[PDB]
Design a protein around this nucleic acid. Structure first.
Ligand code: K
Ligand code: K
Ligand code: K
Ligand code: K
Ligand code: K
Ligand code: MG
Ligand code: MG
Ligand code: MG
Ligand code: MG
Ligand code: MG
Ligand code: MG
Ligand code: MG
Ligand code: MG
Ligand code: MG
Ligand code: MG
Ligand code: MG
Ligand code: MG
Ligand code: MG
Ligand code: MG
Ligand code: MG
Ligand code: MG
Ligand code: MG
Ligand code: MG
Ligand code: MG
Ligand code: MG
Ligand code: MG
Ligand code: MG
Ligand code: MG
Ligand code: MG
Ligand code: MG
Ligand code: MG
Ligand code: MG
Ligand code: MG
Ligand code: MG
Ligand code: MG
Ligand code: MG
Ligand code: MG
Ligand code: MG
Ligand code: MG
Ligand code: MG
Ligand code: MG
Ligand code: MG
Ligand code: MG
Ligand code: MG
Ligand code: MG
Ligand code: NA
Lengths: 48, 272, 92
RNA sequence: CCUUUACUAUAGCUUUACAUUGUAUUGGAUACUAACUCGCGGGCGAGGACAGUGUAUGGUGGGU
RNA sequence: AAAUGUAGGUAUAAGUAACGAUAAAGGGGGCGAGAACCCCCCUCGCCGAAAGACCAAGGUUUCCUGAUCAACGCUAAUCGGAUCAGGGUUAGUCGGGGCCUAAGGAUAAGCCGAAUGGCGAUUCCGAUGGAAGAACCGGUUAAUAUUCCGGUACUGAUACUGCGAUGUGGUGACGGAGAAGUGACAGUCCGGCCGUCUGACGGAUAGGCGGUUAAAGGGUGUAGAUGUUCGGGGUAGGCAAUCCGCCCUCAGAGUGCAACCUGACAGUACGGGAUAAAGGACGUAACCGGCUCCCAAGAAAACCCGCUAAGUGUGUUACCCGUACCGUAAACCGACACAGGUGGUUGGGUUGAGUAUACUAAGGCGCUCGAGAGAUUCGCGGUUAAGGAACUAGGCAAAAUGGUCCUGUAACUUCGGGAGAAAGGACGCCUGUCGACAGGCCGCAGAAACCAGGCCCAGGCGACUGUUUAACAAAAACACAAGGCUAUGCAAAAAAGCAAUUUGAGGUAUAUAGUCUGACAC
RNA sequence: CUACCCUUGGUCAGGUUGAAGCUGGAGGACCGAAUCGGUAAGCGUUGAAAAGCUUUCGAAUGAAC
């Protein structure tokens, strides 16, 4: 059967990528929380 | 002016379509058409504000000249064309100087006629004159509300209005709805009726034709749940109470014209 | 520092054994063909006639510890250089 | 969570008063244009102290 | 010592369930301490509109080779998509990108708003589309190949042998359905030429087997198609809308056919040779962005051509990124080497209406536990005397019908239907004669297997085709074409939003919105 | 993922019937593969699968996928 995750690299970066996070105040708020935690992976732009 | 289909299939049993007999040309003018984008009833925020809109055939928009500003320059009717954007037909005009335009096709206007606009133009079918220069009792369409703005009233297929009286700076006009109101005498109108009067005799015949025209199915309120509609709920069929909309607006006689609109000064008799 | 090292492999030795003017180097991954022709000609003093290129990403070397310590070798670019017919190069 | 002629509120709609807001004739009407509003083209039209809006106030208000 | 209490470890059920589609295996050699499973060979079996071949998405080294068998592999393993090391992806033209714009997104001037901010162009971004810059066949590696090599082409720049945009025009530029005529490739048959062999048993020096090839580009203008037809706009112009003198489609578009072609594949013989290894008959839209009909009336911008305003020859050279491998799957999405899901192209032969069905080529596979034995019982299948729905809530399931052609078809009907109504007959092979006719032959059976309607009578509901409770309900529920009522005169009513603003609609009462009824007849 | 919408692309073997205008070739027309579904039965229920398989069945030029 068709499952929930059907990958598309173009969709992934448009929805969760680094440049989309930086485009809004609430996205930059997410980046600040992940930096303060010390995450090695900041966005999906890192795993690529 | 219509063509009734034989009952070969249950979908064709009750279908009646137009004969397309006034049409003289098959394709539109290149400089007067542009591709037209569809809304699904969504507004600029992306939310659906009008239901039951969606799908249908791709259509091009035609530039219709509702102002008729080329006053004094004669024009000649070249072709009569199909237009998917309106219920009436349209006519292509070649002006004597090189301009081209589309106008709503009046009933009785045919290829090879000459049309004109202006205050010094003959009151003939397809001519645009100020109401001051139009005789009393005439049949007219494409009525301006303000001078210089452009035709707004009496434009649908088969529609017409009669100029009944003169009052100085205002004329008295009877509208298709039965309302009687005063119009400024510097406004403009086109002599005749709108054509394609047999447009109200058509029968779609099947649900599919509605979808070609861009309409989506419409649900009754009594077959929903109370959370969706005030008329919903119940064990078995119920009447749903007083007819009202999703926001609770009475649907059986509530008047919605703003009771202090300024244009009420010009409305002499009302039917709407 | 365009040229990193020549290529001495089984495939390249056979290629040179057929085309005597054909050699292959490892070069910086961001150097273009025009630059590479300049470097091989300004260091071996020859007439380069044609350059072909290919880009290799490095091989991943995933070890395990307490698991999945990823590793990777540096990416490189391969340049296959054709000299003017009648010229050679000696790597010794 | 849902319903309503359960209770209490409330968005919205609607009434009047003050502000925006002026001038004549004869208060309350009639009339005007300069506040204010809309159209054309790049001033001319059409309205007009109304309308719209702020504050206060009565009514309505399972839409919430 | 107890909270269906938490972590770690170890028990019991138990040597039990199970080892993941019933497409299938047997033998001889080999390496090896070790072989049901690994390699080679002979036989057998399965797929073959696929379980073969080529891409996209996604994956990211799984690709090839050497070493290794601890762990992983539902068994063992000398094997592996496993571990380690080495190696492997080559472009002026392919696919991208560079150019253009769609939905949408970000904005400029402006507008709105406790803040954070929300809107807002003809501007920019953004392909799933458009580009006037252009390549195809073959061969070679353990692993790449329009990329390397061979042959034959094409496209930009560059060096030596009056122009006209930022404005404004033209072009680009577009639907669905339908069949026909002409006629390639593939494929089949007939018939020569080249090479090779003489095949368990009766017959055959007459046969068996493998070949006898081809694209882009160039030419011709052939089949066939289309054309005999002074005001309305783009070129002589001023910032597209009140003029005058001037060159035409009379030729366009176009298969097939020449040439490219003294390439190539297989097999023999030894890079070279046979080898420059005839031709036919069908078949055949690849002509066709064509033709005809219809209504639901079928993107945009740029490239490329105008206009004014303002002012051939040769040589060299062609940058960047992708290119391995999987990809109806053991490599992607499903925790698994999981019976599921996954877009596009191709897809030989006989049979056939067919891309159905059956059997086969090329190619790919025998599905990573076996061996004995042949109780009960279960899963999936086969047959059955006499009876024939007596079963059961209910003929559930199964059986039965089933093809082509020729006869023949009722009530009722909205005149279309009902209808393939129902009910019947013929069907193989040989001979001759003009698919048919007659005579004859064989069998229980001639539609030969596979494939392939059961039908009829009468009621309730819903007119009809559709839609629905992803995962217990597909229906009489929903929708529907159509009918009524009510609102709405245009900054329309109505909807969204704090507002600005947007939908309605750039529509205008034969229109739009709310609501109930639901073809039709009465 | 799913519901609806917007822009831009693609796909639908073969046969039958015979409307408008002997010809013609319409249709939310017929039979039936691909495909989209999910009627009935059997099986599975520490399953091969957290919804499947086999047989059967519906639609298959359109309100299609
Ligand atoms: K309804
Ligand atoms: K409610
Ligand atoms: K080995
Ligand atoms: K040859
Ligand atoms: K469904
Ligand atoms: Mg319900
Ligand atoms: Mg009741
Ligand atoms: Mg090269
Ligand atoms: Mg490259
Ligand atoms: Mg409440
Ligand atoms: Mg317990
Ligand atoms: Mg036991
Ligand atoms: Mg047991
Ligand atoms: Mg199990
Ligand atoms: Mg067992
Ligand atoms: Mg197995
Ligand atoms: Mg395959
Ligand atoms: Mg391998
Ligand atoms: Mg083992
Ligand atoms: Mg390996
Ligand atoms: Mg290209
Ligand atoms: Mg752009
Ligand atoms: Mg390969
Ligand atoms: Mg090649
Ligand atoms: Mg541009
Ligand atoms: Mg490859
Ligand atoms: Mg397995
Ligand atoms: Mg699919
Ligand atoms: Mg195909
Ligand atoms: Mg076949
Ligand atoms: Mg088959
Ligand atoms: Mg019996
Ligand atoms: Mg019997
Ligand atoms: Mg009984
Ligand atoms: Mg009984
Ligand atoms: Mg049954
Ligand atoms: Mg029904
Ligand atoms: Mg149905
Ligand atoms: Mg269900
Ligand atoms: Mg069900
Ligand atoms: Mg009803
Ligand atoms: Mg149908
Ligand atoms: Mg099927
Ligand atoms: Mg049916
Ligand atoms: Mg069917
Ligand atoms: Na040619």
């Amino acid at each position: 059967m068709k499952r929930t995750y059907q990958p598309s690299n173009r969709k992934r970066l448009n929805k969760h990528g680094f440049r989309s996070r930086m485009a809004t105040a609430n996205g930059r708020r997410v980046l600040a929380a992940r930096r303060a935690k010390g995450r090695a992976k900041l966005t999906v732009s890192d795993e690529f | 002016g219509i063509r009734k289909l034989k009952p070969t299939t249950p979908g064709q049993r009750h279908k009646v379509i137009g004969a397309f007999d006034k049409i003289t040309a098959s394709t539109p003018e290149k400089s007067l058409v542009v591709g037209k984008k569809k809304t699904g009833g969504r507004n600029n925020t992306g939310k659906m504000t009008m239901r039951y809109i969606g799908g249908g055939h791709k259509q091009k928009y035609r530039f219709i000249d509702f102002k008729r500003t080329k006053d004094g320059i004669p024009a000649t009717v070249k072709t009569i064309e199909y237009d998917p954007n309106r219920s009436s037909r349209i006519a292509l005009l070649y002006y004597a100087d090189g301009a081209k335009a589309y106008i709503i096709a009046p009933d009785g206007l045919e290829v090879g006629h000459t049309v004109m606009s202006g205050s010094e133009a003959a009151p003939e079918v397809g001519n645009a004159l100020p109401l001051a220069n139009i005789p009393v009792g005439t049949i007219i369409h494409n009525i301006e509300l303000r001078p210089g703005q452009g035709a707004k009233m009496v434009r649908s297929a088969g529609s017409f209005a009669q100029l009944t009286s003169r009052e100085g700076t205002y004329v008295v006009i009877k509208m298709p709805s039965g309302e009687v109101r005063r119009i400024l005498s510097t406004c403009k109108a086109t002599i005749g009726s709108v054509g394609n009067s047999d447009h109200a005799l058509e029968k779609s015949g099947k649900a599919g034709r509605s979808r070609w025209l861009g309409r989506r199915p419409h649900n009754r309120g009594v077959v929903m749940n109370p959370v969706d509609h005030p008329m919903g709920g119940g064990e078995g069929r119920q009447s749903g109470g007083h007819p009202r909309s999703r926001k609770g607006l009475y649907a059986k006689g509530l008047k919605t014209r703003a009771p202090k609109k300024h244009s009420s000064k010009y409305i002499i008799e009302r039917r709407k | 520092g365009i040229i990193i090292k020549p290529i001495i492999s089984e495939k390249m030795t056979a290629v040179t054994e057929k085309m005597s003017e054909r050699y292959g180097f490892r070069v910086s991954p961001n150097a273009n063909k025009i630059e590479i022709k300049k470097a091989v000609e300004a260091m071996y003093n020859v007439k380069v006639e044609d350059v072909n290129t290919m880009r290799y990403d490095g091989k991943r070397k995933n070890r395990y510890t307490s698991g999945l310590i990823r590793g990777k070798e540096a990416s490189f670019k391969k340049a296959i250089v054709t000299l003017k017919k009648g010229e050679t190069i000696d790597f010794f």
